[PDB]
Amino acid sequence: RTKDKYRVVYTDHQRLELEKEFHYSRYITIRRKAELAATLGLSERQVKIWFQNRRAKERKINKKKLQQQQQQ
DNA sequence: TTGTGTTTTACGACCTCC
DNA sequence: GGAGGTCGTAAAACACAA
């Protein structure tokens, strides 16, 4: 959810907050999630998923770094 | 423009956890 | 008694050289 829009761009504000809390801890907790969702106007499920996407982004960034250590 | 390669939301299938 | 982890991918959104 939702899905009358295939997917929705989160605001610069919303992404800033999520990137900051991600630096604080890579796995959000049930309470933190509940709080962030409410302060940011997104659902628990959207935070949940965002966190899942961001750790995949990190894994993808990390493999690239590793490939660059390997070539250098 | 465009067209093509990358990044950002959302999900399904499947797995792990006493 | 279910939450939340990954992997892989669709589609929309964006970046950018040609």
Residue numbers in the entry: 184 to 255
Text lifted from the article:
To elucidate the mechanism, we performed structural analysis of two homeodomain proteins, the posterior homeodomain protein HOXB13, and the parahox protein CDX2, each bound to two distinct high-affinity sequences. The optimal sequences for HOXB13 are CCAATAAA and CTCGTAAA that differ from each other by the three underlined base pairs, whereas CDX2 binds with high affinity to similar two sequences that begin with a G instead of a C. Two parts of both HOXB13 and CDX2 DBDs interact with DNA: the recognition helix α3, which tightly packs into the major groove, and the N-terminal tail interacting with the minor groove. Instead, thermodynamic analyses of HOXB13, CDX2, BARHL2 and MYF5 revealed that the two optimal states were bound because of their distinct effects on enthalpy and entropy, principally caused by differential stability of the water network at the protein-DNA interface.
The overall protein structure in the four complexes is highly similar, showing only minor differences in the conformation of the N-termini, due to the replacement of basic Arg-217 of HOXB13 with the negatively charged Asp-187 in CDX2. The corresponding contact (Arg-228 to backbone) is also observed in both CDX2 structures. In CDX2 complexes the DNA bend in CDX2-DNATCG is slightly smaller due to the replacement of Thr-261 with Lys-231 which does not allow the alternative conformation of Arg-228. Consistently, only few water molecules were found in the CDX2-DNATCG complex. In complex of CDX2-DNATCG with high resolution (2.57 Å) the water molecules were well visible but they did not form the corresponding water-chains supporting the idea of entropically driven binding. The channel is not as clearly visible from one side of the CDX2-DNATCG complex because of the presence of Lys-231 instead of Thr-261. The long side chain of Lys-231 does not allow Arg-228 (corresponded to Arg-258 in HOXB13) to change its conformation easily. Together, Arg-228 and Lys-231 close the entry of the channel from this side but the other end of the channel is open and well visible in CDX2-DNATCG. Similarly, the two CDX2-DNA structures also displayed very similar overall conformations.
